[PDB]
Amino acid sequence: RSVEDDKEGHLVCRIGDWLQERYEIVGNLGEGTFGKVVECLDHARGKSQVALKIIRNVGKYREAARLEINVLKKIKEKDKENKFLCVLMSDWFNFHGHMCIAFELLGKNTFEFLKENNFQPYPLPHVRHMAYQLCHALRFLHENQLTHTDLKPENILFVNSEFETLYNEHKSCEEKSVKNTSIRVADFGSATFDHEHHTTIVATRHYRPPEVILELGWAQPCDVWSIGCILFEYYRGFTLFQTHENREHLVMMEKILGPIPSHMIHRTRKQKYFYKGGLVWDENSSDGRYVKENCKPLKSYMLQDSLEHVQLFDLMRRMLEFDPAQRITLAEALLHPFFAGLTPEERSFHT
Ligand SMILES: COCCOc1ccc2cc1OCC(=O)N(C)CCCN(C)Cc1c[nH]c3ncnc(c13)N2
C-alpha cells in the first residue's frame, strides 16, 4: 500500500499498519496543528505500549520536530535515570517526510481531563500534588540551564487518568476525580538553553509573562509565571487571563495583581501601552468593558478561607510577581509551607 497524506500534510493512518517494521498502530489518541498522536505496540520490545507523535509532512514542522528531537537527546543525557518527571523519547525516525517520535504511553492531559469533567476544578489536595511535581520537574531543567517556554495544561499529562465518579457535595451534578495525581511534563520543542538564541516572543498567550509582552528579555522566570497561571486554572477550572491581545492582557494583569512596577515601564520600548506613566486603554470598548466586568483582585478567587487555601494563594501571588528578578524561583517554591500538606507518599514520589 502507498503512503498517503491529506490536504494539510497529515499522514493517513490505519489501524493494523506498521512503521519501521516495528510499530503496529492500535489506536488514535489525538490531533493538533503539528500532526497526530497514535497509540502503537512496539514489536521489537515485547509489544510494549507507545504513543507515537507523527508530524505533518510540511517543511517547517519537520524542522521543528528535528529541533525537539535534539532537545530531547540533551535532556536524557542529564537525566539518564529518568527521575525528574519529563516525557523523554525512546526512538525517532523520518517516515517518508513525517518525523515520528516515540514516547511512553500516558493518560489524558490535564486540560482534557478538566474539559471531560465539564470544567469543574481539581480539589485542593490534587492541585497541591500537581504543583509539587511541576516545581520539581522544572527546577531540574532550570538548574541545567534550560527554560521550557511553553508550559500549559495541555502538555502536562497524567500517568494514568482513570477516575471515580462521585456526586458533587454542593451541586446538582456528578464529578470525576482522578485516582492517581502523578503527572509528567511534555513538549520540549521550544525549550531553550541559556546559550542559545532567545526569540522576542515566547509562550502561549494566556501563559505569557509581562517581561515578554514588554520585550524586556526572558529566562527561567518565564516558566514560573506560566506555573502560577496553570495552578489557578486547575483550582478554578477557568483561565486566569482569557485574552487575545497585549493591551488587554496588561490591563487584566493590573486589575488582578496590582500596578505594573514603574521601573519596568521606564525600561520598555513598548511605550504604546502607556500614557503619563500608566496603562492607557479604552474603557468603553468591548475589551475594556469585558475586563472591567470580569477581572477582579487575585484573592477574590479563593473558594475557602482555611489555611491551605490562603497558602496556595500566597504561593500563586509570588509566582505571579511582575518583576522576573523578584519572582519566586522553583527552588524557593519547594520550600513554601503550602507543601506541608502533602502526604508522605506524595512528598517522596511513591505515587
Ligand atoms: C486531540 O484532542 C484531545 C487529545 O489530545 C492529545 C492526545 C494525546 C496527547 C496529547 C494531546 O493533546 C496535547 C498535544 O497534542 N501535545 C501536548 C503534543 C503531543 C504530546 N504527546 C505526544 C505527549 C505524549 C507522550 N505520551 C503520551 N501518551 C498519551 N497521550 C499523549 C502523550 N499525548
Short mmCIF file of C-alpha atoms and ligand atoms in Angstrom, two decimals:
data_model
loop_
_atom_site.label_atom_id
_atom_site.label_comp_id
_atom_site.label_asym_id
_atom_site.label_seq_id
_atom_site.Cartn_x
_atom_site.Cartn_y
_atom_site.Cartn_z
CA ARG A 1 0.00 0.00 0.00
CA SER A 2 1.08 3.57 -0.79
CA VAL A 3 1.82 6.15 1.90
CA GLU A 4 -0.88 8.82 1.77
CA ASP A 5 -1.12 12.32 3.19
CA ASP A 6 -4.20 14.55 3.48
CA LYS A 7 -4.51 18.10 2.18
CA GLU A 8 -2.82 19.52 5.31
CA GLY A 9 0.17 17.09 5.14
CA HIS A 10 -1.11 14.77 7.86
CA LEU A 11 -0.27 11.06 7.48
CA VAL A 12 -3.33 8.93 6.68
CA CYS A 13 -3.12 6.33 9.50
CA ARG A 14 -4.74 2.92 9.55
CA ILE A 15 -5.10 0.52 12.44
CA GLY A 16 -3.05 -2.54 11.62
CA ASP A 17 -0.35 -0.62 9.75
CA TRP A 18 3.31 -0.94 10.78
CA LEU A 19 6.04 1.66 10.69
CA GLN A 20 9.88 0.92 10.69
CA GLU A 21 8.95 -2.79 10.56
CA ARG A 22 8.22 -2.40 14.26
CA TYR A 23 5.33 -0.16 15.42
CA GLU A 24 1.80 -1.53 14.99
CA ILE A 25 -0.95 1.12 15.13
CA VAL A 26 -3.67 0.20 17.60
CA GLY A 27 -5.49 3.46 18.27
CA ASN A 28 -5.78 7.22 17.55
CA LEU A 29 -5.16 9.44 20.63
CA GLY A 30 -5.42 12.98 19.20
CA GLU A 31 -4.70 15.52 16.53
CA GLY A 32 -3.35 19.06 16.50
CA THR A 33 -1.87 21.59 14.17
CA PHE A 34 1.52 19.74 14.28
CA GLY A 35 0.19 16.29 13.30
CA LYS A 36 -1.29 13.38 15.16
CA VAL A 37 -0.72 11.21 18.19
CA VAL A 38 -1.35 7.48 17.89
CA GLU A 39 -1.15 4.52 20.20
CA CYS A 40 1.11 1.68 19.00
CA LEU A 41 2.52 -1.63 20.15
CA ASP A 42 6.34 -1.93 19.75
CA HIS A 43 7.01 -5.38 18.38
CA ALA A 44 10.81 -5.09 18.78
CA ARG A 45 10.36 -4.51 22.53
CA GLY A 46 7.83 -7.18 23.54
CA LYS A 47 4.69 -5.39 22.34
CA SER A 48 5.26 -2.53 24.77
CA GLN A 49 2.76 0.35 24.59
CA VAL A 50 3.95 3.52 22.83
CA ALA A 51 2.49 6.93 21.97
CA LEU A 52 3.84 8.00 18.59
CA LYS A 53 3.76 11.69 17.64
CA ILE A 54 3.53 11.75 13.87
CA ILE A 55 4.41 15.18 12.43
CA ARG A 56 2.88 16.61 9.27
CA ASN A 57 4.92 16.40 6.02
CA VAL A 58 5.48 20.17 5.95
CA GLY A 59 8.99 21.61 5.97
CA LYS A 60 8.56 23.97 8.87
CA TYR A 61 7.01 21.32 11.16
CA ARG A 62 9.72 18.83 10.08
CA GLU A 63 12.44 21.34 11.09
CA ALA A 64 10.67 21.99 14.40
CA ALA A 65 10.46 18.25 15.14
CA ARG A 66 14.22 17.84 14.40
CA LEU A 67 14.82 20.60 16.97
CA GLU A 68 12.59 18.83 19.54
CA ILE A 69 14.49 15.57 18.94
CA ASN A 70 17.81 17.34 19.55
CA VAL A 71 16.49 18.92 22.79
CA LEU A 72 15.15 15.58 23.96
CA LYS A 73 18.60 13.96 23.40
CA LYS A 74 20.22 16.57 25.68
CA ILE A 75 17.58 16.24 28.40
CA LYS A 76 18.07 12.44 28.55
CA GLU A 77 21.89 12.91 28.88
CA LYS A 78 21.26 14.96 32.02
CA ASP A 79 18.64 12.61 33.50
CA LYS A 80 19.80 9.15 32.37
CA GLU A 81 17.81 7.56 35.20
CA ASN A 82 14.55 9.32 34.16
CA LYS A 83 13.82 10.57 37.72
CA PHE A 84 12.58 14.16 37.07
CA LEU A 85 9.13 13.60 35.61
CA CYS A 86 9.82 14.55 31.96
CA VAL A 87 8.45 12.64 28.98
CA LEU A 88 11.70 11.50 27.18
CA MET A 89 11.79 9.82 23.76
CA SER A 90 12.52 6.15 23.19
CA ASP A 91 13.02 6.44 19.41
CA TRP A 92 12.59 8.79 16.44
CA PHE A 93 12.51 8.32 12.70
CA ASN A 94 11.65 10.10 9.44
CA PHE A 95 8.80 8.18 7.82
CA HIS A 96 8.53 9.47 4.23
CA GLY A 97 8.88 13.06 5.36
CA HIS A 98 6.84 12.68 8.58
CA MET A 99 9.03 12.97 11.68
CA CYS A 100 7.82 10.42 14.23
CA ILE A 101 8.77 10.46 17.93
CA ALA A 102 8.04 7.53 20.18
CA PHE A 103 7.13 8.10 23.86
CA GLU A 104 5.86 6.10 26.84
CA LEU A 105 2.05 5.80 26.71
CA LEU A 106 0.39 8.15 29.24
CA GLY A 107 -3.14 9.12 30.32
CA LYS A 108 -5.11 12.23 29.37
CA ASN A 109 -3.55 15.64 29.56
CA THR A 110 -4.62 17.87 32.40
CA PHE A 111 -6.66 20.19 30.11
CA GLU A 112 -8.55 17.25 28.51
CA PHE A 113 -9.30 15.79 31.91
CA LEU A 114 -10.62 19.18 33.10
CA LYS A 115 -12.73 19.56 29.91
CA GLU A 116 -14.19 16.00 30.27
CA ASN A 117 -15.16 16.98 33.86
CA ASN A 118 -17.17 19.93 32.45
CA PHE A 119 -14.54 22.34 33.76
CA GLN A 120 -15.23 21.53 37.39
CA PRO A 121 -11.89 22.21 39.10
CA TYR A 122 -9.47 19.84 40.75
CA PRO A 123 -9.73 19.54 44.57
CA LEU A 124 -7.02 21.43 46.55
CA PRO A 125 -5.09 18.26 47.50
CA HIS A 126 -4.81 17.35 43.78
CA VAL A 127 -3.74 20.90 42.92
CA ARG A 128 -1.10 20.71 45.67
CA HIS A 129 0.36 17.41 44.47
CA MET A 130 0.41 18.54 40.83
CA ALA A 131 2.05 21.82 41.89
CA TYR A 132 4.75 19.95 43.80
CA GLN A 133 5.57 17.75 40.83
CA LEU A 134 5.68 20.68 38.39
CA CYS A 135 8.03 22.65 40.62
CA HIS A 136 10.19 19.52 40.96
CA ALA A 137 10.40 18.77 37.20
CA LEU A 138 11.04 22.35 36.16
CA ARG A 139 13.51 23.03 38.97
CA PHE A 140 15.71 20.29 37.49
CA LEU A 141 15.54 21.79 33.99
CA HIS A 142 16.24 25.28 35.35
CA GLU A 143 19.31 24.01 37.23
CA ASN A 144 20.56 22.60 33.91
CA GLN A 145 20.34 25.90 32.04
CA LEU A 146 17.06 25.16 30.27
CA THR A 147 13.74 27.02 30.10
CA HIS A 148 10.60 25.21 28.70
CA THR A 149 8.88 28.47 27.48
CA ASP A 150 5.53 26.81 26.63
CA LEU A 151 4.12 25.31 29.83
CA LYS A 152 0.33 24.96 29.79
CA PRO A 153 -2.26 22.40 30.96
CA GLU A 154 -2.26 20.50 27.63
CA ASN A 155 1.44 19.50 27.84
CA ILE A 156 1.15 18.20 31.39
CA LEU A 157 -0.19 14.61 31.36
CA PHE A 158 -1.45 12.17 33.98
CA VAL A 159 0.49 8.88 34.12
CA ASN A 160 -2.94 7.23 34.42
CA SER A 161 -6.13 9.25 34.16
CA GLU A 162 -8.61 6.58 35.43
CA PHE A 163 -11.21 8.24 37.66
CA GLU A 164 -14.01 7.70 40.22
CA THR A 165 -17.42 9.29 39.56
CA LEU A 166 -18.77 10.99 42.64
CA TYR A 167 -21.91 13.05 43.32
CA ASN A 168 -20.94 16.72 43.93
CA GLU A 169 -21.32 17.67 47.56
CA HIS A 170 -22.84 21.03 46.92
CA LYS A 171 -24.11 21.00 43.31
CA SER A 172 -26.86 19.09 41.47
CA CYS A 173 -24.38 17.01 39.35
CA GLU A 174 -21.65 14.33 39.12
CA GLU A 175 -17.87 14.95 39.31
CA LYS A 176 -14.84 12.94 38.06
CA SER A 177 -11.94 12.58 40.45
CA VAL A 178 -8.59 11.22 39.17
CA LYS A 179 -7.46 8.10 41.10
CA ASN A 180 -3.78 8.96 40.85
CA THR A 181 -2.46 12.51 40.51
CA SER A 182 1.06 11.55 39.24
CA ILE A 183 1.91 13.74 36.24
CA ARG A 184 4.68 14.19 33.63
CA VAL A 185 5.79 17.26 31.66
CA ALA A 186 5.95 17.06 27.86
CA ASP A 187 6.53 19.06 24.70
CA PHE A 188 10.11 20.38 24.74
CA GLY A 189 10.39 21.63 21.14
CA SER A 190 10.50 25.33 22.18
CA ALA A 191 12.74 24.65 25.16
CA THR A 192 15.80 26.89 25.06
CA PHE A 193 19.26 26.64 26.68
CA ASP A 194 20.83 29.74 28.26
CA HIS A 195 23.49 29.94 25.48
CA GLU A 196 21.05 29.66 22.59
CA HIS A 197 19.15 32.40 20.71
CA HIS A 198 16.12 33.78 22.63
CA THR A 199 13.22 34.86 20.39
CA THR A 200 11.43 38.09 21.31
CA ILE A 201 8.08 36.40 21.95
CA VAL A 202 7.62 33.00 23.66
CA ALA A 203 4.80 31.09 25.44
CA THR A 204 1.15 30.61 24.58
CA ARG A 205 -0.63 33.90 25.18
CA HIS A 206 -2.70 33.02 28.24
CA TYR A 207 0.52 31.74 29.96
CA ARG A 208 2.83 34.53 28.72
CA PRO A 209 4.59 36.78 31.33
CA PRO A 210 4.78 40.60 31.32
CA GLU A 211 8.52 40.77 30.59
CA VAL A 212 7.84 39.03 27.30
CA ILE A 213 4.94 41.39 26.39
CA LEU A 214 7.13 44.37 27.28
CA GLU A 215 10.09 42.86 25.28
CA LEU A 216 12.44 43.11 28.30
CA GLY A 217 14.04 39.68 27.64
CA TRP A 218 13.28 36.44 29.44
CA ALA A 219 14.81 33.44 31.12
CA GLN A 220 13.75 30.75 33.59
CA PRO A 221 11.29 33.03 35.49
CA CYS A 222 9.04 32.83 32.36
CA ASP A 223 8.22 29.24 33.36
CA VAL A 224 7.32 30.23 36.97
CA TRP A 225 4.73 32.72 35.71
CA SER A 226 3.27 30.04 33.50
CA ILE A 227 3.06 27.65 36.51
CA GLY A 228 1.20 30.37 38.51
CA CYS A 229 -1.34 30.61 35.74
CA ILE A 230 -1.67 26.80 35.50
CA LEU A 231 -2.28 26.38 39.23
CA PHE A 232 -5.07 29.00 39.07
CA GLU A 233 -6.70 27.17 36.19
CA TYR A 234 -6.50 23.82 38.00
CA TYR A 235 -8.07 25.42 41.14
CA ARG A 236 -10.95 27.33 39.46
CA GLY A 237 -11.37 25.42 36.18
CA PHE A 238 -11.16 28.62 34.16
CA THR A 239 -8.25 30.55 32.59
CA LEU A 240 -6.68 33.35 34.64
CA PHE A 241 -6.08 35.56 31.58
CA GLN A 242 -8.74 34.88 28.93
CA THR A 243 -7.18 37.34 26.48
CA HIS A 244 -6.36 37.72 22.86
CA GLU A 245 -4.35 40.95 22.81
CA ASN A 246 -1.43 42.63 24.57
CA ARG A 247 -3.03 45.81 25.81
CA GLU A 248 -5.99 43.92 27.20
CA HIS A 249 -3.68 41.34 28.80
CA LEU A 250 -1.73 44.08 30.61
CA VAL A 251 -4.94 45.69 31.88
CA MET A 252 -6.07 42.27 33.22
CA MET A 253 -2.71 41.86 34.95
CA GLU A 254 -3.15 45.28 36.68
CA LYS A 255 -6.70 44.52 37.78
CA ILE A 256 -5.80 41.05 39.18
CA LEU A 257 -2.29 41.66 40.59
CA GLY A 258 -1.92 45.47 41.04
CA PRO A 259 0.14 48.15 39.32
CA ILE A 260 2.99 47.30 36.96
CA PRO A 261 6.28 48.45 38.56
CA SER A 262 7.43 51.87 37.35
CA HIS A 263 10.93 50.58 36.66
CA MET A 264 9.57 48.09 34.08
CA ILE A 265 7.52 50.86 32.41
CA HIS A 266 10.63 53.11 32.19
CA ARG A 267 12.69 50.40 30.53
CA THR A 268 10.28 49.02 27.90
CA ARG A 269 10.42 50.13 24.33
CA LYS A 270 6.67 49.30 24.07
CA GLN A 271 5.65 52.78 25.18
CA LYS A 272 2.42 52.45 23.01
CA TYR A 273 0.81 50.79 26.04
CA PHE A 274 1.42 53.77 28.31
CA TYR A 275 0.44 57.45 28.70
CA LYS A 276 1.67 59.66 31.57
CA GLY A 277 3.29 56.62 33.26
CA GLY A 278 0.15 54.49 33.42
CA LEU A 279 -1.52 51.97 31.14
CA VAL A 280 -3.63 53.61 28.51
CA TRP A 281 -6.76 51.87 27.24
CA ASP A 282 -10.35 52.44 26.16
CA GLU A 283 -12.70 51.65 28.99
CA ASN A 284 -15.76 51.85 26.72
CA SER A 285 -14.59 49.29 24.09
CA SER A 286 -15.71 45.63 24.00
CA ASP A 287 -12.40 44.56 25.57
CA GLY A 288 -12.45 47.40 28.12
CA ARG A 289 -15.91 46.56 29.32
CA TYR A 290 -15.12 42.80 29.43
CA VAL A 291 -12.09 43.40 31.68
CA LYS A 292 -13.89 45.88 33.99
CA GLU A 293 -16.77 43.39 34.49
CA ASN A 294 -14.76 40.19 34.85
CA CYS A 295 -11.21 40.77 36.19
CA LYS A 296 -11.06 41.11 39.99
CA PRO A 297 -8.20 41.09 42.56
CA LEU A 298 -6.49 37.69 42.84
CA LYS A 299 -7.55 36.99 46.47
CA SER A 300 -11.26 37.34 45.46
CA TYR A 301 -10.93 33.98 43.60
CA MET A 302 -10.27 31.92 46.78
CA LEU A 303 -13.00 29.31 47.31
CA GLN A 304 -12.42 28.87 51.06
CA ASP A 305 -10.73 30.76 53.91
CA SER A 306 -8.82 27.93 55.55
CA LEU A 307 -5.04 27.81 55.98
CA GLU A 308 -4.22 25.62 52.94
CA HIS A 309 -6.17 27.96 50.60
CA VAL A 310 -4.51 31.03 51.99
CA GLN A 311 -1.09 29.33 51.45
CA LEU A 312 -1.92 28.34 47.87
CA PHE A 313 -2.80 31.94 47.10
CA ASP A 314 0.39 33.24 48.76
CA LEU A 315 2.47 30.95 46.59
CA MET A 316 0.47 31.84 43.47
CA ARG A 317 0.92 35.60 44.07
CA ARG A 318 4.69 35.01 44.36
CA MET A 319 4.79 33.13 41.09
CA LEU A 320 2.83 35.99 39.51
CA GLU A 321 5.26 38.79 40.52
CA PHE A 322 5.64 41.31 37.72
CA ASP A 323 9.44 41.69 38.03
CA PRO A 324 11.05 38.49 36.96
CA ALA A 325 14.06 39.14 39.17
CA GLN A 326 11.77 39.36 42.22
CA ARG A 327 9.56 36.43 41.20
CA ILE A 328 9.87 33.28 43.35
CA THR A 329 12.27 30.61 41.99
CA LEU A 330 11.19 26.97 41.93
CA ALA A 331 13.84 26.08 44.37
CA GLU A 332 12.24 28.54 46.88
CA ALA A 333 8.72 27.44 45.85
CA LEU A 334 9.55 23.89 47.02
CA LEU A 335 10.28 25.31 50.49
CA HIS A 336 6.83 27.01 50.78
CA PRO A 337 4.54 25.99 53.63
CA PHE A 338 1.72 25.12 51.16
CA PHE A 339 3.63 21.86 50.64
CA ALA A 340 3.43 20.84 54.33
CA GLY A 341 0.01 19.41 53.32
CA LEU A 342 1.46 16.69 51.06
CA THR A 343 1.10 13.10 52.22
CA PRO A 344 4.44 11.35 52.71
CA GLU A 345 3.69 9.25 49.60
CA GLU A 346 3.24 12.43 47.60
CA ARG A 347 6.43 14.06 49.03
CA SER A 348 8.72 11.06 48.45
CA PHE A 349 7.44 10.39 44.90
CA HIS A 350 5.91 6.96 45.71
CA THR A 351 2.72 7.60 43.73
C1 LIG B 1 -6.88 15.97 20.33
O1 LIG B 1 -7.73 16.36 21.41
C2 LIG B 1 -7.50 15.67 22.61
C3 LIG B 1 -6.36 14.70 22.59
O2 LIG B 1 -5.15 15.46 22.71
C4 LIG B 1 -3.97 14.77 22.95
C5 LIG B 1 -3.86 13.39 22.94
C6 LIG B 1 -2.67 12.77 23.28
C7 LIG B 1 -1.58 13.53 23.71
C8 LIG B 1 -1.69 14.93 23.76
C9 LIG B 1 -2.87 15.55 23.36
O3 LIG B 1 -3.01 16.92 23.32
C10 LIG B 1 -1.85 17.74 23.53
C11 LIG B 1 -0.77 17.52 22.48
O4 LIG B 1 -1.07 17.02 21.39
N1 LIG B 1 0.51 17.83 22.79
C12 LIG B 1 0.93 18.43 24.06
C13 LIG B 1 1.57 17.46 21.86
C14 LIG B 1 1.87 15.96 21.85
C15 LIG B 1 2.37 15.42 23.16
N2 LIG B 1 2.31 13.94 23.26
C16 LIG B 1 2.92 13.23 22.07
C17 LIG B 1 2.96 13.53 24.50
C18 LIG B 1 2.60 12.14 24.93
C19 LIG B 1 3.51 11.23 25.38
N3 LIG B 1 2.88 10.08 25.78
C20 LIG B 1 1.54 10.23 25.57
N4 LIG B 1 0.56 9.35 25.85
C21 LIG B 1 -0.67 9.77 25.58
N5 LIG B 1 -1.06 10.93 25.03
C22 LIG B 1 -0.05 11.79 24.74
C23 LIG B 1 1.33 11.51 25.03
N6 LIG B 1 -0.36 12.98 24.12
#
